[PDB]
Every structure is written in C-alpha cells, then in structure tokens.
C-alpha cells in the first residue's frame, strides 16, 4: 500500500491534516482527516497542478488536469483529476473529511504526490453552476489553505 | 526539463526557496536558491524520506536512502541519495545555494518529489567525523527548517 499526507496552512484561521491511502496501484484512494477554521457550509476541495507554495496558495496554479477535461464533481466522468468536490464544515468550524476516489492516484500520470491540495472560500458548484467559470474552477472562490502532498510512512 | 521547488520554513525565521531543475531523467539535478536566518558557517542539507510535516520537520524521518547505503558527502560513492552535504551561511545570515548533483532525481526510484528538504543546525561531517552517528546522520544536529519538494511549472 502507498500513503501520502498533506498539511493545510494559509494566511488566516484555516488549517488541517489530510491523509491518503491507496491499497493497490490500480485501486481507489481513501482521503481522510480534519480541517478547522472553516465557515459553516461547503468548501471547494481540489488538487492543483503545482506543488509550488513560493507565494502561498496562488503559486499552485490551476486544477490538476492531465487529461485536458472540463471541471466537474468527483462522481462525474467529465472532471479534472484534481476535482475532489467539497468538504462540509458545521458551526464548530470543523470539516471531518472522509472521501474515496477512483480517479486520483499515488502513482502514474494521475499521481498527486508533489502537487498542492487546496481548500476554498466557497462551495464548488461541481460544474453545474449557471456560468462559464463553473466548467473551469466551479466558482469556489479564494484559496484559504493549502499544502504540498508528500510521501508518508 | 523537469522542475521542482521547496519552501523551507522554520523558527528564526529560517526561510528559504530552493529550486530544482533536471534537463533529462538520466541527467544531473541543478539545485539553487537562498536561505535566510542561518548562523554563520556550515549547515547540513539533506533530502529526508517522508514528505510528512504533520508534527514539523521530525515527521520527515531519516535521510532518503533507497539503496540502503551509509551516510556520506555528495562526492562520495558511499552516500544516501538524500546526502547533499552543507550550505554555507555568511555573517549576513544568508546561504546562497548552488549545487549540481548526479544521484538525486526528479523521476524514477531516486525521485525526491514529495520528500522533505531539511537544513540542519550544525555542519554535516560528510561521514568522515569518525563516530557511529557520522555514518548515519553526519552529526548535523537539529532540523532548523524544512519543506516538501513539489512539482514546479
Ligand atoms: Zn481550487
Ligand atoms: Zn476542476
Ligand atoms: Zn545521509
């Protein structure tokens, strides 16, 4: 089994730890952990292309999209590899993250190791929004916290 | 070419940006950038195995050592893949980093993407120090700053 880990940090109150586990090379990736300091509601949750934090989360670039697809939700065929949908925060400002995804990987051309995980200001509309930006970013707003996805023990 | 980047952060502030560039997978990696907030003298400079900064630089584990070798300097045949020797800080507290290395890579089994770059408290004795610790850590002492090595544009 392969494992990875990401420490989310930013300029404000948002911080988290996210774990990745892939039992088999061809298999789904379990994503789990916790994020604190979030407003109640949905927050866009994406793997962005670059593991570049030189200028904070802006340097991470666009959604990781090795197959040149449009933006969607994790359960859509038409999605970026990086499209992990939304995490949900309650009034406690905590999002408990528990995802299984078949499109990201910890090896090969879908590999997310060395790329950046970002949690966003607003909801990702999963490409179903009423504008052009829906099909590109999902209108999830600014980047609250991010980290480079690293190889774990 | 393949490129990677690492933001070093630690108490001080010890703060640096280190760039990696590899023209070809069978070629050397150029490593360059700047680190500020260091004491004058040599500081051990290593790639550690895990890109895990969960509990700070300690979570990164030992020197990256995929070939099960002993610790050495970058010029030694007998070294860990992660053994990049020392960076030198002047009285200005700045280390200007300019390294070329044939053993690290940005792809394959010696790939350092998703691992942690660490700058150390003391000099790495390059395995010539003559105690047991020399052949394992190089006696470079505590971890001042670290970051996960990410894929760059
Ligand atoms: Zn995003
Ligand atoms: Zn997307
Ligand atoms: Zn070593």
Residue numbers in the entry:
A (entry chain F), B (entry chain A): 1 to 153
Task: Copy out sentences from the published article reporting this entry, exactly as the authors wrote them.
SOD1 is a homo-dimeric enzyme with copper and zinc centres responsible for regulating the level of toxic reactive oxygen species particularly in the cytoplasm. The destabilisation of the SOD1 dimer is a key driving force in fALS and sALS. Dimer dissociation is a critical aspect for SOD1 destabilisation, leading to the emergence of toxic aggregates in motor neurons.
Due to the different degree of response to drug dosage and disease progression from ALS-associated mutants between human (A4V) and mouse (G93A), we validated mode of action of ebselen-based compounds in mouse model’s mutant by solving co-crystalised structures of G93A SOD1. Moreover, modification of cys111 by the ebselen-based compounds does not influence the overall conformation of G93A SOD1 compared to the ligand-free structure with RMSD values of 0.16–0.25.
